């Protein structure tokens, strides 16, 4: 009979097989495919889901704060943040034997604990947290915020509180409020916290809710701000002998732009970060008054889009009708948001390792490596999702009649040229990068290392020289002492920036050579190939020569059968599917390069990387084989240490990856026949045929098989690299 689950799909509820549960779980968030769904109901469900997501995020943050305040060593880590390892949380496992108990008992705790690698200790220490009471109060506050967000999500679904469809389409009002309030006012408030709490707490002065109304952030007290003498806030900054957390060497300035890093914490100045947030707050608030909402002044995005067509007709109709195809399509907005968020996540990773913002973050090698790898993998997944949603937009929301002659239609008009050129770029990069690598490998194998091709990256070195690095000797722009660009910043920020960039002990514009050139080309190959697969799948989503009516089958369908030569993996979903492997490979190459260069930097031997990164054998032996010795020795027949959990996780990831290869290689048919034999065996077995199944056992579908195999592949990939990176970086240092 018809089952209750899933309530959103009547066709799935009538399915008498096990496929009903799987499809009900995988199509729960596809509100557009639900039964009796309207546009207004769609937007309302997304609103409630957004509130629930915020509730989960805030609860997770409160949980991290609570566990650090309860089972951590934050009160002891602030005293000696160079020789004390941060504690994530305690370990309570009845499966642990005695050696595992004393092995994980470290960091000054009274029992087995986990050493945190997220870097929340440095972040909380920099923003002003000093005691466990502060973390406890922050945890309770975030839990209350999470409960409020959850209640808001439940409340916006009840009658008299459901927003209308017209409210969700007010793009001008939403953009104005997000730029001025969500971005500008939030940044201004963060500036207020840095000026009022973080900066005085870094100078040994406690400023909490009990005394912030009686403690002045500056000795002049708002007089220079109102009189326009803003330069008075940059007078007397922290000297080079300032000790973080104490008043020794501290200054009085609150808004500076010294640049560079703090001599002790090796991080950005707090006054510089406060000034940064103040400037971007003013800029975002000003930008929040651009669109017309209810007072006559402002813009209409439709007018700006319609008045942006070239006169010669190079772009056809230009952007006519682009306002309606974006405002009425949620997949277009989701794709734009994911593309921007993925790029910003990558930007965060690069800027965070190169310019550490938190105190004593550069010394924590494990934290730096884990944070960079985490943000780069998150960025790669988000980028793949952006392109997948672009393909979904082409299939479900693109209207050729409304987008007639504009840039959107012209993209599909010459999609063959785009795919062909992406293919050519990827082919050239792959052929040459692989050829140079194999050539260097043959030269190193034959005992002639002077015969390998080592192309110097003169363009990137030229840019590094433009930033102030005098190692290469170009002597121009910031590298030349007689340039206008150099002389115009010598009194504001160039001294600190130049001192930091010319220091070879940090990660600020590291020295590069032929190995960096080759790996950068490998990165370019990965980016271009992943882009080729994603772009080709989005452009061919509506159809191709093999499947002229692909848009009539949806975004995800198994195939079109073995006819016409065979149509396996013809849908756009399959294109995203194949692109996830390339994304994992690209992020693997970038994280491998980052980890090896930083490992050789921290070990004090950059020549090892410079001489072994030019051939793949050096990558396999000097980086993968050499750095995994301590990892695989976490547990051996002679005993175990605290690094055994990473060894177990290493083997765990290998097992999950290999398990994924099963769903990836073997296909449905074999499993369906095997399941039929199992059905016969259960039906003909006494004492067991009395227990019957409620859902008919069937093999996983083709699409489900691909998703399951990719999920196992990605999980094994991530867990294996995370275990190796954390174990190698923590054991070495």
């Amino acid at each position: 009979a018809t089952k209750l689950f899933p309530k959103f799909s009547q066709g799935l509820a009538q399915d008498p097989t096990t496929r009903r549960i799987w499809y009900g779980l995988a199509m729960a968030h596809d509100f557009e495919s639900h039964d009796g769904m309207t546009e207004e109901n769609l937007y309302q469900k997304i609103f409630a889901s957004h509130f629930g997501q915020l509730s989960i995020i805030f609860l997770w943050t409160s949980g991290n704060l609570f566990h650090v305040a309860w089972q951590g060593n934050f009160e002891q880590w602030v005293t000696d943040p160079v020789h004390i390892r941060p504690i994530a949380h305690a370990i309570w496992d009845p499966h642990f034997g005695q050696p595992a108990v004393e092995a994980f008992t470290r960091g000054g705790a009274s029992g087995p604990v986990n050493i945190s690698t997220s870097g929340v200790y440095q972040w909380w220490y920099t923003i002003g947290m000093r005691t466990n009471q502060d973390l406890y109060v922050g945890s309770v506050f975030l839990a209350l915020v999470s409960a409020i967000f959850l209640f808001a999500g439940w409340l916006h679904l009840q009658p008299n509180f459901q927003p209308s469809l017209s409210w969700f389409k007010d793009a001008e009002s939403r953009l104005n409020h997000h730029l001025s309030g969500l971005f500008g006012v939030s940044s201004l408030a963060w500036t207020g916290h840095l000026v009022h709490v973080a900066i005085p707490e870094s100078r040994g002065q406690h400023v909490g809710w009990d005394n912030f109304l009686s403690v002045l952030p500056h000795p002049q007290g708002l007089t220079p701000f109102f009189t326009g003498n803003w330069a008075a806030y940059a007078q007397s900054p922290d000297t080079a002998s300032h000790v973080f957390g104490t008043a020794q060497g501290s200054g009085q300035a609150i808004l500076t732009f010294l640049g560079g890093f703090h001599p002790q914490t090796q991080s950005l100045w707090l006054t510089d970060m406060a000034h940064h947030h103040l400037a971007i707050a003013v800029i975002f608030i000003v930008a929040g008054h651009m669109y017309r909402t209810n007072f006559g002044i402002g813009h209409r995005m439709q007018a700006i889009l319609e008045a942006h067509t070239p006169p010669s007709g190079s772009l056809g109709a230009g952007h006519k009708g682009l306002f309606d195809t974006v405002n009425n399509s949620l997949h277009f907005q989701l794709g734009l948001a994911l593309a921007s968020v993925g790029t910003i996540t990558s930007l965060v990773a690069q800027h965070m390792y190169s310019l550490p913002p938190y105190a004593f973050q550069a010394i924590d090698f494990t934290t730096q490596a884990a944070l960079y790898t985490h943000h780069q993998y998150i960025a790669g997944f988000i980028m793949c999702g952006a392109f997948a949603h672009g393909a979904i937009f082409f299939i479900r929301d693109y209207d050729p009649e409304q987008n007639k002659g504009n840039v959107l239609a012209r993209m599909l008009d010459h999609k063959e040229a785009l795919i062909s050129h992406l293919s050519w770029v990827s082919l050239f990069l792959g052929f040459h990068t692989l050829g140079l690598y194999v050539h260097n490998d043959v030269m190193q194998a034959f005992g002639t290392p002077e015969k390998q091709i080592l192309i110097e990256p003169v363009f990137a070195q030229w840019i590094q020289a433009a930033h102030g690095k005098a190692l290469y000797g170009f002597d121009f722009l910031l590298s030349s002492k007689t340039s206008a660009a150099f002389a115009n910043g010598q009194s504001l920020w160039l001294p600190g920036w130049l001192d930091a960039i010319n220091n070879n002990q940090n990660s600020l514009f590291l020295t590069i050579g032929p190995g960096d050139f080759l790996v950068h080309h490998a990165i370019a190959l990965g980016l271009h190939t992943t882009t080729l697969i994603l772009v080709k799948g989005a452009l061919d989503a509506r159809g191709s020569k093999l499947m002229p009516d692909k848009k009539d089958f949806g975004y995800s369908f198994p195939c079109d059968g073995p006819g016409r030569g065979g149509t396996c993996d013809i849908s756009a979903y399959d294109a995203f599917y194949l692109a996830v492997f390339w994304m994992l490979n690209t992020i693997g190459w970038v994280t491998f390069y980052w980890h090896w260069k930083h490992l050789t930097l921290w070990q004090g031997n950059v020549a090892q990387f410079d001489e072994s990164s030019t051939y793949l054998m050096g990558w396999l032996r000097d980086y993968l084989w050499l750095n995994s010795s301590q990892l695989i020795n976490g547990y051996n027949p002679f005993g175990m240490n605290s690094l055994s959990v990473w060894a177990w996780t290493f083997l765990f990831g290998h097992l999950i990856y290999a398990t994924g290869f099963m769903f990836l290689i073997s296909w449905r048919g074999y499993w369906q026949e095997l399941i039929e034999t199992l059905v016969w065996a259960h039906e003909k077995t006494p004492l067991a045929n009395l227990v019957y199944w409620k859902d008919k056992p069937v093999a996983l579908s083709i699409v489900q098989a691909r998703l399951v195999g990719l999920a196992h592949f990605s999980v094994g990939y991530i867990f294996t690299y995370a275990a190796f990176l954390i174990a190698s970086t923590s054991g070495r240092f």
Binding site: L213, S214, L216, P219, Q220, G221, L222, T223, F226, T227, N294, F295
Partner: protein, 183 residues
Amino acid sequence: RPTWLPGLNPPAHLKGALAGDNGFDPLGLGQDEGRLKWYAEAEKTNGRWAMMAVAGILGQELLGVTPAWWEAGAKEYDIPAQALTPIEFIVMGFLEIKRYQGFKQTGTSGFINSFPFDPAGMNSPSMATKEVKNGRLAMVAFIGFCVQALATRTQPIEGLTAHLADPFGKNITYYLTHLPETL
């Protein structure tokens, strides 16, 4: 009917039927009559609470209490603040739920089950306009009390006497500029 801006016509959603209707709604928060009447009740009760708060602060200062109005929370009292919060929440929940349910039956204020709570008569539309205007003045006065205590650290009557003693000085300019001297 005079409006807030000279030469500005009052909006269509705002009609002189309400008590203090002066055609002031640049943001257009009272487009529908449902939200308009709910906001009217919200304005009346906000003004009532502000009237009682301003009267209490002025009475506390006039009677010479030891702590200022912004320190009464931390003052020692029998049945500490940790125990006063649940009692207040329970009684306020009962009183407010009775007030809200009485508002659904009839569009007027009340007290538990007296809707409208009007003993001894003396009710008229002019009195309603006076109530709304006094509530608005009390709300603005309470915000003035808060910002005055923040920037000058002086109580309302004390700050008023300080301003009367020296008019050309001891104002927003002096207090905003001579901020370190005040602390």
